[PDB]
């Protein structure tokens, strides 16, 4: 199916409190597999899933090498950006980088990503041509002129069309019974009396991986999306995900309502009701 490899770089300046701290994490889909913290003593790159632990120690040395690179480059970015926006040396600021690749079902590069934010907002991002940048404003524009002059995109390309797809296929293969063994939700409705006028019917989905799921209520074939309560999908803490959708119905009327669950983990969509 469609799989993704993404890294998430976060560097935060700590005015007064020494040099900026850098944090990196690596994900395949909704599974984290590495981390790095510049503040950890003798700071290495640490495995965070079982299927990476089975790589030669060089795999981790190389990554370590690269995160230290990333940490130091950011230390400089943070200070040049203060310059750019003409900000004092007083406040904490944040630089974020998300990059990686998507593969299509046939296992070839679909899409590549290289985007930056400053203080939570769009700074610069590599367009889909993999050659030009979208800068968010006049500051990022300076970076566009520089990186386009230097021809930096070409080096991200190298990595995209080289290492990125390569290591994704390697992870997908080395973690099949996790990353391609998709967990179906175990679904159940609960019954929460509120008043004489309404019972809350809550459709629970638990133990699903990956996170993506459609949780929907119908009264008499008729979708209640606009009229239903629905939490943002949440991590169980064991690598699986949770979600519920609730509806306030007149008591007696429960059997008018059917909850529906769509997940790639499901051979066929589940329709269930109260009991």
């Amino acid at each position: 199916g469609p799989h993704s490899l993404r890294y998430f770089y976060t560097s935060v300046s700590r005015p007064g409190r020494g040099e900026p701290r850098f944090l990196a994490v690596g994900y395949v889909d909704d599974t984290q597999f590495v981390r790095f913290d510049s503040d950890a003593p003798n700071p290495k790159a640490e495995p965070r899933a079982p299927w990476v632990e089975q790589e030669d120690p060089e795999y981790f040395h190389r990554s370590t090498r690269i995160f230290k690179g990333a940490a130091q480059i950011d230390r400089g970015n943070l200070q040049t950006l203060r310059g750019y926006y003409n900000q004092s040396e007083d406040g904490s600021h944040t630089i974020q980088r998300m990059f990686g690749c998507d593969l299509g079902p046939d296992g070839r590069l679909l899409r590549g990503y290289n985007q930056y934010a400053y203080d939570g907002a769009d700074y610069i991002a590599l367009n889909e041509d993999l050659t030009s940048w979208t800068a968010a404003d006049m500051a990022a524009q300076i970076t566009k002129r520089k990186w386009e002059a230097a021809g930096d995109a070409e080096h991200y390309r190298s990595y995209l069309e080289g290492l990125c797809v390569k290591w994704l296929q390697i992870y997908l293969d080395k973690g099949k019974e996790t990353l391609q063994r998709a967990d179906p939700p175990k679904a159940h409705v609960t019954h929460h009396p509120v008043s004489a006028r309404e019972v809350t019917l809550r459709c629970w989905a638990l133990g699903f991986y990956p996170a993506d799921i459609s949780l929907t209520w119908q009264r008499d074939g008729e979708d209640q999306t606009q009229d239903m309560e629905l939490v943002e999908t949440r991590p169980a803490g064991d690598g699986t995900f949770q979600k519920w959708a609730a509806v306030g119905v007149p008591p007696g009327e429960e059997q008018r309502y059917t909850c529906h669950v769509q997940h790639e983990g499901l051979p066929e969509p589940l329709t269930l009701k109260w009991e």
């Binding site: 690269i66 480059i73 230097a150 930096d152 991200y156 990125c164």
Partner: peptide
């Protein structure tokens, strides 16, 4: 597998 940017901002 990660990558650092050749240049700063």
């Amino acid at each position: 597998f990660p990558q650092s940017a050749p240049h700063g901002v």
